[PDB]
From a paper:
RbAp48 (Retinoblastoma‐binding protein 48, also known as RBBP4 or NURF55) is a WD40 repeat containing histone binding protein which is found as a component of a variety of histone modifying complexes including Hat1, NuRD, PRC2, and CAF‐1. WD40 proteins typically act as scaffolds for assembly of larger complexes and RbAp48 has two characterized binding sites for protein complex formation. In order to develop tool compounds for the study of RbAp48 function, we have developed peptide inhibitors targeting the protein–protein interaction interface between RbAp48 and the scaffold protein MTA1. Here we report the design, synthesis and evaluation of macrocyclic peptides derived from MTA1 as potent inhibitors of the RbAp48‐MTA1 interaction.
Although cyclization significantly improved the IC50 values, the newly formed amide potentially is positioned above a hydrophobic patch on RbAp48 formed by Phe 30 and Leu 31. Therefore, a range of peptides was synthesized which were cyclized using the same amino acid positions but via a cysteine alkylation strategy. In this method the residues used for cyclization are replaced with cysteine and benzylic dibromides act as crosslinkers on the unprotected peptides. For xylene linker peptides derived from 4 an increase of potency was observed to 18.7 nM and 15.1 nM for 7 and 8 respectively. The improvements in IC50 proved the advantage of introducing a hydrophobic linker for this macrocycle design. Encouraged by these results we investigated the molecular details of the interaction between these peptides and RbAp48 by X‐ray analysis of cocrystals. The cocrystal structure of peptide 8 with RbAp48 revealed that the xylene linker was in close proximity to Phe 30 on RbAp48 similar to the hydrophobic cluster of the original R2 peptide. The crystal structure confirmed our hypothesis of the advantage of a hydrophobic linker over an amide linker and indicated a possible π‐stacking interaction. We tried to take advantage of the potential π‐stacking by preparing a variety of substituted linkers which would modulate the interaction by either having electron withdrawing or electron donating effects on xylene linker (compounds 28–32). Surprisingly, all modifications led to a 1.5–2.5 fold reduction in potency, potentially indicating that the interaction is driven by van der Waals forces rather than π‐π interactions and bulkier substitutions are not tolerated. Under the same conditions monocyclic peptide 8 did not yield a binding curve indicating it has a lower affinity than both 2 and 33 which further confirms that bicyclization is advantageous.
Numbering used by the authors:
A (entry chain A): 10 to 89, 113 to 413
B (entry chain P): 2 to 15
The structure:
């Protein structure tokens, strides 16, 4: 066990030697507290000149010892850096997942380990806790508490927000009709289909009525809000052989999505026939907690999790001819293994404004903002 | 050798 950390400590050092051949950019920043959550804000502010542009990122803290925080970081990326903390806002309870609303990115929804969803507006707060008036207690006695992290806004209907609820359900809130300064929003719909703990949920990127959900009952379920029966979904798959922890819809193909899970596989799915898994991506050594599609490339997905590895997959190399010496290192669809993290990667987001740039966060307070070398993705050498 | 080194980043490239 103690010798297993030394294997991680030495293979970090070969990676740091491997860094100028494999990356066009590596930034590494220790945060003050580890983050479970990472999402890039959609605005870029380049000034003309400076040799950089300013991009923004949504973080959180997950500690019980101090006052918790919701963090906006500014990250300077060159155009041939610096990572500072822009906003710190006092969040009550641990930040499991933090996502912005697309119809106003100042509105950020957070998922807590309690049964609620908090919503902040960062313009309506002080930028730093120069008060430092904690609301944080001295003990926290959680009894029966296991919850998943999933939280997703509808990009086609403003205010419709899903989350993974506490007793195997999915809740829908419509925050567009906010009530008259009561500031408590009850659930519009409660979706009662899964038999174990719902881990991740996501709205469809094109149709406003559809969403997908994954859970610990090995099931991917596809729903429709116009259905009168909210106890049964429209489709149900026996997706994986273990706990399904993440899903992501393809932004270029409306029928295509991908689920990653605790059987170390990322599955590939068509919506019009869910009884056939299209492809099983296999190179993770442990449990997968995040899968995200490239917003600049149809063919490209990435996955991350417990094995300290962020794999980056390429669908256009599936079924390729391969040598025995190439097949040792993985499948031909495996484009890139990141390997900067020495602890379990909790979350990652692709940058929407600079292509191939990823921020990824792990549990040893490391945030890494990186981008692989231009020769490796363009098939050029 | 850079496409091969992307798939084995814990081994040194050669
Ligand atoms: C092409 C090439 C890649 C990486 C190394 C270390 C050497 C040559």
């Amino acid at each position: 066990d103690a010798v297993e950390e030394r294997v991680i400590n030495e293979e970090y050092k070969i990676w740091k030697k491997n860094t100028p051949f494999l990356y066009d950019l590596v930034m590494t920043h220790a945060l003050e507290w580890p983050s479970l959550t990472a999402q890039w804000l959609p605005d870029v502010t380049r000034p003309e000149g400076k040799d950089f542009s300013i991009h923004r990122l949504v973080l959180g803290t997950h500690t019980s010892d101090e006052q918790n925080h919701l963090v906006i970081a500014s990250v300077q990326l060159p155009n041939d850096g610096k990572i500072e903390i822009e906003i710190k806002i006092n969040h009550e309870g641990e930040v499991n997942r933090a996502r912005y609303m697309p119809q106003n990115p100042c509105i950020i929804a957070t998922k807590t380990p309690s049964s609620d969803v908090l919503v902040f507006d960062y313009t309506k707060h002080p930028s730093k806790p120069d008060p430092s008036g904690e609301c944080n207690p001295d003990l926290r006695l959680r009894g029966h508490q296991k919850e998943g992290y999933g939280l997703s806004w509808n990009p086609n209907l403003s205010g419709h927000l899903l989350s993974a609820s506490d007793d195997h359900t999915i809740c829908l809130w419509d925050i567009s009709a906010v009530p008259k300064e009561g500031k408590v929003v009850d659930a519009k719909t409660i979706f009662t289909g899964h038999t174990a703990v719902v881990e991740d949920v996501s709205w469809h990127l094109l149709h406003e009525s559809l969403f997908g959900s994954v859970a610990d009952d090995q099931k991917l379920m596809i729903w429709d809000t116009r259905s009168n029966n909210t106890s049964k979904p429209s489709h149900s798959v026996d997706a994986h052989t273990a706990e399904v922890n993440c899903l992501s819809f393809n932004p270029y193909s409306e029928f295509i999505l991908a689920t990653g899970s605790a059987d170390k596989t990322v599955a590939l799915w068509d919506l019009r026939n869910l009884k056939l898994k299209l492809h099983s991506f296999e190179s993770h050594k442990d449990e997968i907690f995040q899968v995200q599609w490239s917003p600049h490339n149809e063919t490209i997905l990435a996955s991350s999790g417990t094995d300290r590895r962020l794999n980056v997959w390429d669908l256009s190399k599936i079924g390729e001819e391969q040598s025995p010496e190439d097949a040792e290192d993985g499948p031909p669809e495996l484009l890139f293994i990141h390997g900067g993290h020495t602890a379990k990667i909790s979350d990652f987001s692709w940058n929407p404004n600079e292509p191939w740039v990823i921020c990824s966060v792990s549990e040893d307070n490391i945030m890494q903002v990186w981008q692989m070398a231009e020769n490796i993705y363009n098939d050029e050498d | 050798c850079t496409k091969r080194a992307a798939r084995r980043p814990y081994k040194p490239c050669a």
